[PDB]
């Protein structure tokens, strides 16, 4: 078995709830354990980041 524990990752100034028609949990969803980081607005410059664990 596997033991899932949060990495406490949190971000400021981007989108973190990307969705896609493939991962379809009664609507456009994504991987339950992952985050699809996107720019705040379309085409907007994405900020360089560095997260550790």
């Amino acid at each position: 078995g596997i033991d899932k524990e949060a990495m406490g990752f949190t971000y400021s100034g981007i989108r973190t709830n990307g969705a896609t028609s493939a991962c379809r949990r009664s609507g456009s969803s994504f991987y339950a354990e992952m985050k699809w980081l996107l720019s705040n607005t379309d085409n907007a410059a994405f900020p360089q980041m560095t997260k550790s664990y």
Partner: antibody
Amino acid sequence: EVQLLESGGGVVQPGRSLRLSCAASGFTFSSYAIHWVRQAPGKGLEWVALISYDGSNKYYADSVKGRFTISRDNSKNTLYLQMNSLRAEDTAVYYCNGHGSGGEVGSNWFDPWGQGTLVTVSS
Amino acid sequence: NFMLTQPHSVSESPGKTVTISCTRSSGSIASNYVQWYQQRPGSSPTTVIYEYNQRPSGVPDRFSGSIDSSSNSASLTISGLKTEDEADYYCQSYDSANRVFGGGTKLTVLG
């Protein structure tokens, strides 16, 4: 059922201020980013401003920076464009226009436009 | 940063095919998506093409989008013109977050 309602248009003089509003109904307003796009009479379209889904980011046209200020109230589903220190050229029809992915990448094309509110600035 | 230049006007006989160009002054046309908008007199604009070639639900098969990386342009083409198509057309691309509109192209169908 999805619609955008521009309000607050009228005739003004230069140097004064104005405020515009857009009423959104028929879709998840809180998720898409919203844009202000105008068009002077006999002229073509010109993108004015945009604000993100959560108001964190606001992007203005270089020809309008400093004067206009965009804002939104998601609890009221309303868009606001603050056009203070107006000029003569700002005379145009003003459309509110939703334009954004909205969290989804498949994203059938969703780009609604209102009917546009006339803003005449004569002396 | 850049500007999109499209011809001031174009005309062609009904039933014939017509193409409208959209040339980007600085930066690759493939760097950012290009949307094609149709504006009829007095009416609000309606998107005819999005993401360089995608035909939204409702637009007939006559409308097609294309990219010419060589001339750094984007072309909107209508086959079998009809008098309803007589409107202004604007191409729009993206600077980093800001939208950029073309100069407009008055398409008149010969009557």
